[PDB]
Amino acid sequence: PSPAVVGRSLVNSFKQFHTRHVDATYRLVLDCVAAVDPLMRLYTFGSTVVYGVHEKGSDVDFVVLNKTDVEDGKGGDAATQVAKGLQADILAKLARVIRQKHLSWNVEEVRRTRVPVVRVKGGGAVDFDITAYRRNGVRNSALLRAYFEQNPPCRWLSMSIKRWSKQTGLNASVIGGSITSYGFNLMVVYYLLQRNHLQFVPPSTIDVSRVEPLPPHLPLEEPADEGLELGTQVLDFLHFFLHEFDSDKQVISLNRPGITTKEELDWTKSAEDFARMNGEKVHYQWCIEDPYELNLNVGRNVTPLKRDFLRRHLEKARDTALLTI
Ligand SMILES: O=c1ccn([C@H]2C[C@H](O)[C@@H](COP(=O)(O)OP(=O)(O)OP(=O)(O)O)O2)c(=O)[nH]1
Numbered sequence: 001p002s003p004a005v006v007g008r009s010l011v012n013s014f015k016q017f018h019t020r021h022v023d024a025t026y027r028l029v030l031d032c033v034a035a036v037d038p039l040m041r042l043y044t045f046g047s048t049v050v051y052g053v054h055e056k057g058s059d060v061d062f063v064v065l066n067k068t069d070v071e072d073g074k075g076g077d078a079a080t081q082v083a084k085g086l087q088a089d090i091l092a093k094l095a096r097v098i099r100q101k102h103l104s105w106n107v108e109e110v111r112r113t114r115v116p117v118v119r120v121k122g123g124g125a126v127d128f129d130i131t132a133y134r135r136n137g138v139r140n141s142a143l144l145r146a147y148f149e150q151n152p153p154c155r156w157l158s159m160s161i162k163r164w165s166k167q168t169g170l171n172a173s174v175i176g177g178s179i180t181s182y183g184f185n186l187m188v189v190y191y192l193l194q195r196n197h198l199q200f201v202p203p204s205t206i207d208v209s210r211v212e213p214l215p216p217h218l219p220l221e222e223p224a225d226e227g228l229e230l231g232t233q234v235l236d237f238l239h240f241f242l243h244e245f246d247s248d249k250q251v252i253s254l255n256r257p258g259i260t261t262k263e264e265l266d267w268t269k270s271a272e273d274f275a276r277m278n279g280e281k282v283h284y285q286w287c288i289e290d291p292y293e294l295n296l297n298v299g300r301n302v303t304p305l306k307r308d309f310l311r312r313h314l315e316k317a318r319d320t321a322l323l324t325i
């Protein structure tokens with residue numbers, strides 16, 4: 001349909017959809033962390049931090065950090081077996097404490113993934129993940145927030161894509177999904193950077209030691225133009241990734257303004273046969289580069305097939321105003 005049709009249908013679909021009771025949750029989690037180790041920092045990261053708002057059905061993501069992890073706010077998270085084991089060890093303790101403190105809460109320690117994470121479900125509002133000893137999660141969010149503070153209405157695009165990604169099952173937060181919401185944010189941001197809607201922010205200007213464990217909220221003004229800018233952006237975004245972005249040669253990347261190629265990173269077929277993250281192949285089919293991690297494809301789970309599925313969903317998205325019509 002037209003941008004006008006698209007944009008209006010999206011705004012319509014957003015009625016029930018700020019940072020209300022994340023304080024209360026952050027404090028419940030801080031309670032448990034203090035019991036493990038009173039000197040440990042707790043940080044919020046994830047959509048609450050990225051958007052400056054909390055959306056319906058979004059969990060809350062926390063990370064547990066040592067002071068020296070913070071004060072060294074420009075140094076990478078190590079890949080290694082030991083780092084991964086250290087995180088699971090600290091997470092195992094905290095999970096113990098949470099279950100003691102919250103008999104109603106399911107607290108699950110998830111190992112499959114690259115990053116050790118504890119998933120907590122307590123019905124209703126209680127929905128949160130906790131990770132440990134990793135500043136790139138907070139540094140990635142703060143980068144994404146830096147960009148969204150530049151042009152706050154771009155969050156509407158990112159949010160529209162995020163919901164869609166979940167409806168269609170592309171999102172890794174759904175069973176079968178393969179790209180996390182974070183990956184879709186990088187696309188939206190890379191996309192907007194390409195269209196000159198955002199101004200480049202060198203990842204290296206983001207200091208973790210300066211980030212607020214719980215940043216302030218960012219007022220979310222509903223679209224005044226009946227939604228026409230949004231529909232224009234949704235349409236243009238889907239276009240960009242079907243017909244402009246070349247996935248065979250290009251890397252969705254925030255590390256430099258302009259174009260990044262796969263050859264430049266050695267993100268090639270030869271690299272697939274040498275890799276195996278969590279015992280499995282990494283794929284360089286749909287390339288999305290993590291700004292702070294070493295050599296990490298946020299699209300390592302996008303098989304040649306899922307790349308086809310994605311491309312198919314992108315077409316259908318164009319024809320249905322992101323499945324709103
Ligand atoms: O592979 C990842 C995924 C997430 N993050 C960090 C940066 C990201 O901005 C934040 C949270 O992203 P997530 O994909 O967990 O989604 P969300 O932003 O919390 O959205 P929602 O919770 O609505 O799915 O965690 C990473 O560094 N690497």
Ligand SMILES: [Mg+2]
Pocket residue numbers: 046047048058059060061
């Ligand atoms: Mg979240």
Ligand SMILES: [Mg+2]
Pocket residue numbers: 046059060061129
């Ligand atoms: Mg999460």
